[PDB]
From a paper:
We tested the AeGe on dipeptidyl peptidase (DPP8) crystals using two ligands which evaded complex formation by regular soaking methods. Both 1G244 and the E67-interacting loop (EIL) peptide (SLRFLFEGQRIADNH) are inhibitors of DPP8 and DPP9. 1G244 is a model for a water-insoluble mol­ecule and the EIL peptide is a model for a low-affinity binder: neither forms complexes with DPP8 using classical soaking. Similarly, to soak 0.5 mM EIL peptide in a solution of 50 mM TMAO, an r.h. gradient was started at 97.3% with 0.1% steps/45 s down to 80% (2 h 10 min in total) with a gas temperature of 19°C. In contrast to the method employed to soak 1G244 (DMSO soluble), spraying the EIL peptide (water soluble) implies reaching an equilibrium at the end humidity, not crossing the lower optical shrinkage threshold, and thus the dehumidification stops automatically. Given that 4.5 M TMAO is approximately in equilibrium with 80% r.h., the equivalent accumulation of the EIL peptide in this experimental setup was theoretically 90-fold, resulting in 45 mM peptide as the final concentration in the crystal. Similarly, we determined the crystallographic structure of the AeGe-soaked DPP8–SLRFLFEGQRIADNH crystals at 3.0 Å. Strong positive electron density is observed in the active site assigned to the EIL peptide, albeit not complete. Interestingly, the binding mode of the EIL peptide closely resembles that of SLRLFLYEG, first in the anchoring of its N-terminus to two glutamic acids, and second by the induced-fit formation of an S2′ hydro­phobic sub-site to allocate the F4 residue. Moreover, both ligands induced the ordering of the R segment, a common feature of peptide-like binders. However, the reason why the EIL peptide has lower binding affinity compared with SLRFLYEG remains elusive. In fact, the only sequence difference (F to Y) does not provide further clues, since both residues are exposed to solvent without forming strong contacts.
Here we present the development and application of the Aerosol-Generator (AeGe), a new gentle soaking device that complements the humidity control and uses ultrasonic vibration to generate aerosols of ligands to soak reservoir-free protein crystals. The AeGe technique uses reservoir-free crystals under a temperature/humidity-controlled gas stream. In other words, ligands are directly soaked into protein crystals without being diluted in the crystallization drop. Two protein model systems confirm the advantages of using the AeGe method in challenging complex formation scenarios.
Residue numbers in the entry:
A (entry chain D), D (entry chain D): 1 to 10
B (entry chain A), C (entry chain A): 48 to 105, 109 to 139, 148 to 897
């Protein structure tokens, strides 16, 4: 699916 | 009304500001407890009724447990203490599965549990481990030591599963084949010899026990084998374990090349990518029959295939969406779609449909005729739709009381246009078709008569069955718990209703919060992860009980807190949910972040963050201070931030979602502009001369469609990992929404921004493209081919590449760079005083 | 001094301006005549002495001829009329060879000619053709029809060559093997079975008759086979034709992947790319002995190999730089470098060194012992150097008068430090080493004593031997014509000198013009293509003659114009060549484009265009109005434009070129800043606060080194297709200048801008990267890996990709987009009034 | 060699 993922955190 | 101009900070200052604002979330971004399980202590003298096990972050993600008291002091609030279950001690296929499952975590993603023995089974890095707790062995009072399942296999073992019939046995996948391993006797056998690890991809395209790319990416199925839950006994005092498994052949599937992450090497990996219109993999069911002797030694392994081909028995089927076994183990079930994804079928498959594999054509013919003609596929349920079938995880089968009937609950949108529960009973007829006659079966020869179809729920609201949402079925009190949108489309709540004499849908969760709920298997407890716009996520245990006068009526009571809310963080000002009547007839909801220190007589620039794609809702009553924290940061710098759930987004029923069938790109920006203009008429501070639009993936797709269709409204567009060309995207997704390219020539053409490059503005500093260089889902080509046409059309662009990144941001430095560049681009080309002078 | 700010035009206006300025060069960019050849008419009664054939653009590039009168009317100027020789009628390997040879043209690139028969042979698209003129067959007065050499071969035929011994026979390469074909009898035979076209690259890495990548890209050798010029006769009345050929095995060479141009496919091609430090291909000589009967039918083909291995006979050799035959055909010669490229060897190889190939080890041993021990490799010349050997095309061998002596001219820089001609005679001794003894030969066992080494030229100036520059040797009058830099380093001129009693180097070309010259084989005529800063290219024929008193003295006289100059085009204001004494001791030359309409009291922004790499000189007295037209366009918009030939550039001798040995990147920007500051002290109008720097390839490399080392001087940098990391670039180039990575750890580190990402500025709009996405020479990785480190270092960049482009711009829309973006970037971030406010 | 080529003209 066209769903990006933001799971790179500091 | 004078224009507000944002503080023009330098690159180094913006980096500072972004660092300091992020630094107040060290305590935050620690993911909530999940994968809950309840286990009874069965100790009449002891002070605890249950023990719960769950995965959580203490660093890595591990197994914890907590104790459930028999009674509580209702004066004070009990905080359950977290007890570590374990003691303190990526490959390519793990890296890809973490993209397919959208897992951001580190450590243990999931776990099996055999109830009868206490056996936990879980993967953790390369290792497959086990521990015991809560079986006959009893309950530990201190950390257990994980016991590595040893192996001869050289490469990573994926997808471990305990045999429910025998907890000594497990199964895993290694180099695209199914193996089994005994955790007591250390015996290790390969069950399938379908893939050769030493060969190339181009010659060896077969696998077994694995879900292919499209199934992982588009149907959320990440496994291709299923243990039979019961073991047949033999005259020896041994047993026959069974495993249903999917076998694929990707020979005819096209081969794309994606850049390897080791950029040094300057090479590229082959992927089998079924692009739209082309061949999907060739699938079929198979079965592995494993004879175990008295003490757990493998006597023999017989590999069995379908009596006739898959294409003949299950005519029309392209995708095995879901599969498993009935609780008795008598039938293997499967949910089957056609290519268009407008016809679902639930089909039972008897183990007697499978016969041993034989190369000898003499021997094979004796086995075929020896199987009875009455043994046949049984289509127990079928449904069609004009729009599309949304696959979900709801499918519950009851113990088979009568011989030739099967009773089950299923969810569907094909009747009303909203997903609702339906109890169904089908009569398992002997089929009209006979194999002796030597013909092919006609379309409906395997269909079963529907004896009963009672609708359990109904109305202008949907039951949830994705992303963990499912149903618990209390077979004693004859109830069914489920999650739904009945009270509001902006709030998920837990409901309960009778499945025999249905009527009163009783809500169990408290209003003003959206909930995510896990119900105990014993149905005497449930856990809710809840939040709202103001208050961060909380996790609480509630006890379920009935009044003495009416067991059907269920009420709840707070028992204890599993995770306490950190509280409102002073930096985060939440957005205000608004709504408006669109000229289409539907009510569309939105979110408004007003600028901080809003001065009267001044109008502010406006970033519109967007997704607006299927299977997603951005606007709801959940805490957005974690994931969408930087929308508040934009509001702190003096940007209006809008977000609108346009037609096509989920949780509003099938007609609402089906609004862009065949027409992706064309309808969405109207809804966004409409909602944006409704606000500017209502608010003096929204500057419509300086509007930005920004989104990722489908949001990036629409960010381009906005600038293309409506350059009058949108000054700038930041398109992240956009689809520029639908013939490039895969079958499972794009044919579901847009059909086959031949049968929608114009939709594809108008949906593809790379075909319409000349319609972009001829003024620079308005189009910014962002893309992960290693993207295997939305291939970089989308951007590279778009840029190819922009160059020929004489149009300007700005480009930022993230070379360590796929269809996600995982390396933290990439995300820091992105936020920094985004703010600086918005500042230099929209917000600031210099941005005004540039035009 | 007030700052001048350039006219801030929009993107659409700049596109207009760029179109209209380019539109006045429709008549221009029609390449000059080339590949000249003279042929005597031998008609005492007829009015013409010679006929000349040459390639030129009429559209496509074809064969023309013109007539040379016996006498001229010296009152008027004769314009030779161009007569079409032919009548009016890309694959992957053609596309790549056009990158390797740097061919921009369309049509016929080159042609063979057998003198004795009149036979022309040439490739044109996929076809190999032939025509006849000037042999016994006579001279046509009208267009001939090209005669296609028919074939059974399915794929493109590359590299056709006429057999000089027999013009009925040709040879070509097809699917990396050598074939022959008779153009009368239509017989077609494959001579080598080394490559299998149907297999993959990874299994089948061998080829024959072909120059591998590094030889094409770095040594300008584009062929790997050579016809023997004489045919041995047999007792039958038949003959034995011979072909020396190089055979490669690229199995151990690394495999990179480059994106395929068909972006739709989303695939990638394998290339064998010997990156620095890794294995070069494994080469060897072989020979094909072809027995032809009385009437031109192939009796048999014997394939022969070296009697001992290549690595034993030619100890130390990595590259076969050049090869061919002596005019007699008695020996096959070769010029051989070692890996470091600090040792050259000229080596004669007798055909008796080659023995037939035999699988049978019994049969093979009889053939080895049957060959005499006296037959041996003959190193006729050897030279070493601290710096490097520059390979050139000068090597002339005289008819062998004495038996055990060979006389020849060769050019070298190893004595004086400037390339000069030397007549040499070597004594062909029987070697000390004997094959019967059964040992390996010691380092210098094949060396030949130098009987004579007379230097023909000398001084602080060099003979030219690259890019068509060579020598004609008049063996009657005992002279040698050659091109050189004696009168000036900014002007190439044609010289002549005696090779027996050398002394007076007589210049033949007129001063104030740089010349490119082709001398007739009969030495009674020469053609000069000439130009200077003001006047465009012209092509004229000059007649050579001696005074009666002294044949050694040569004078010239204008005969006729082949191509007339279009004249000074009013848009183009040429640059002024300046120079300055650098603190290194060397004089460095430069070019200054002053701004048009230079107003006093105002200081202008300054683009410094740069290359500053080896094997190239940008500053000289040649017409720059064609290739560097847009430097004038920048000067018309009000930019100062500077260009400086720093240390390392060519035409100044080896010491000057060797200035950056091991130290690439470190010295060049000092020279540029020095020359730039010399100008600003001398001129009031040079604004040093607003300096841009821009270059392609090595110029792009230095554009980054400038911004990295000297952010104080350079405001912006536009780096096109830069090398960011030297471990990625190939052996042949990078080991020549920088050595092996192990033996220059620091040079590589300091030469690689990707290792020093944190040294770039933390202010945006200063770094712009440009790169062709399909670049096979400077792989895109250079940019992608540089960007990877810039993201981690938190540094900003701007990026433009050209997806249809390799290490060149060929699609016209790409070049239009580039110039447009360049002007707009310079305007927005350097030149304009808004560029001042941005800081 | 590190030598770019501009032979795409209109
Ligand atoms: Na997925
Ligand atoms: Na070359």
């Amino acid at each position: 699916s066209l769903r990006f993922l933001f799971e790179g955190q500091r | 009304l004078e224009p507000f101009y944002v503080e023009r900070y330098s690159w180094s200052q913006l980096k500072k500001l972004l660092a300091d604002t992020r630094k107040y979330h060290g305590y935050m971004m620690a993911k909530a407890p999940h994968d809950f399980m309840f286990v009874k202590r069965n100790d009449p003298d002891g002070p605890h009724s249950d023990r719960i096990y769950y995965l959580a972050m203490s660093r890595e993600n591990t197994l914890f447990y907590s104790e459930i008291p028999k009674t509580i002091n209702r004066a004070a609030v009990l905080m359950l203490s977290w007890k570590p279950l374990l003691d303190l001690f990526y490959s390519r296929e793990e890296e890809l599965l973490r993209e397919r499952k959208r897992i951001g975590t580190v450590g243990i993603a999931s776990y099996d549990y055999h109830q009868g023995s206490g056996t936990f089974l879980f993967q953790a890095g390369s290792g497959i481990y086990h521990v015991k707790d809560g079986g006959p062995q009893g309950f530990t009072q201190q950390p257990l030591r994980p016991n590595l399942v040893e192996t001869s296999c050289p490469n990573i073992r994926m997808d471990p599963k305990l045999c429910p019939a025998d907890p000594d046995w497990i199964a895993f996948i290694h180099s695209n084949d199914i193996w089994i391993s005994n955790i007591v006797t250390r015996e290790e056998r390969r069950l399938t010899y379908v893939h050769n690890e030493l060969a190339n991809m181009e010659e060896d395209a077969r696998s077994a026990g694995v879900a292919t790319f499209v199934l992982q990416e588009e149907f959320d199925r990440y496994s291709g084998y299923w243990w039979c839950p019961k073991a047949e006994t033999t005259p020896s005092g041994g047993k026959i374990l069974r495993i249903l498994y999917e076998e694929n052949d990707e020979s005819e599937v096209e081969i794309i090349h994606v850049t390897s992450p080791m950029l040094e090497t300057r090479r590229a990996d082959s992927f089998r990518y079924p692009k739209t219109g082309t061949a999907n993999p060739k699938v079929t069911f198979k079965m592995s029959e494993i004879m175990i002797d008295a003490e757990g030694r493998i006597i023999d392994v017989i590999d069995k295939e379908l009596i006739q081909p898959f294409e003949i028995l299950f005519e029309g089927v392209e995708y095995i969406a879901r599969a498993g076994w009935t609780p008795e183990g008598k039938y293997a079930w499967s949910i089957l779609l056609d290519r268009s994804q407008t016809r679902l079928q639930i089909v039972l498959i008897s183990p007697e449909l499978f016969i041993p594999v034989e190369d000898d054509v003499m021997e094979r013919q004796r086995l075929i005729e020896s199987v009875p003609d009455s043994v046949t596929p049984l289509i127990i349920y079928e449904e069609t739709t004009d729009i599309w079938i949304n696959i979900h995880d709801i499918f519950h089968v009851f113990p088979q009381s009568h011989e030739e009937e099967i009773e089950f609950i299923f969810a569907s949108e094909c009747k009303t246009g909203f997903r609702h529960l339906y109890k169904i009973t089908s009569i398992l007829k002997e089929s009209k078709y006979k194999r002796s006659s030597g013909g092919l079966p006609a379309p409906s020869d395997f269909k079963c008569p529907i004896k009963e179809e009672i609708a359990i729920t109904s109305g202008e609201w949907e039951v949830l069955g994705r992303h963990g949402s499912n149903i618990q079925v209390d077979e004693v009190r004859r109830l069914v718990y489920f999650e739904g949108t009945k009270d509001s489309p902006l709030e998920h709540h837990l409901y309960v209703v009778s499945y025999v004499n249905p009527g009163e849908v009783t809500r169990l969760t408290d209003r003003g919060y959206s909930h995510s709920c896990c119900i105990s298997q014993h149905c005497d407890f449930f856990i809710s992860k809840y939040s709202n716009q103001k208050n961060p996520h909380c996790v609480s245990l509630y006890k379920l009980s009935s009044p003495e006068d009416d067991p059907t009526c269920k009420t709840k009571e707070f028992w204890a807190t599993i995770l306490d809310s950190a509280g409102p963080l002073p930096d985060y000002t939440p957005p205000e949910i608004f709504s408006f009547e669109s000229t289409t007839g539907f009510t569309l909801y939105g979110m408004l972040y007003k600028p901080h220190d809003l001065q009267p007589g001044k109008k502010y620039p406006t970033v519109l963050f967007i997704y607006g794609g299927p299977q997603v809702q951005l606007v709801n009553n959940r805490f957005k201070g974690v994931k969408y924290f930087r929308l508040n940061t934009l509001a702190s710098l003096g940007y209006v931030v809008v977000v609108i759930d346009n037609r096509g987004s989920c949780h509003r029923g099938l007609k609402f979602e089906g609004a862009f069938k065949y027409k992706m790109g064309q309808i969405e920006i109207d809804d966004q502009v409409e909602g944006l203009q409704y606000l500017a008429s209502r608010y003096d501070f929204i500057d419509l001369d300086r509007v930005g639009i920004h989104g990722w993936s489908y949001g990036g797709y629409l960010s381009l469609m906005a600038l293309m269709q409506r350059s009058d409204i949108f000054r700038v567009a930041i398109a992240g990992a956009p689809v520029t060309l639908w013939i490039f995207y895969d079958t499972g997704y794009t044919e579901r929404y847009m059909g086959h390219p031949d049968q929608n020539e114009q939709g594809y053409y108008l949906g593809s921004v790379a075909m319409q490059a000349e319609k972009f503005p001829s003024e620079p500093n308005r189009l910014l493209l962002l893309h992960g260089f290693l993207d295997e889902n939305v291939h970089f080509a989308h951007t590279s081919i778009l840029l190819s046409f922009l160059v020929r059309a004489g149009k300007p662009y700005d480009l930022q590449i993230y070379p360590q990144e796929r269809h996600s941001i995982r390396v933290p430095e990439s995300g820091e760079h992105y936020e920094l560049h985004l703010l600086h681009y918005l500042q230099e080309n929209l917000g600031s005083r210099i941005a005004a002078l540039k035009v």
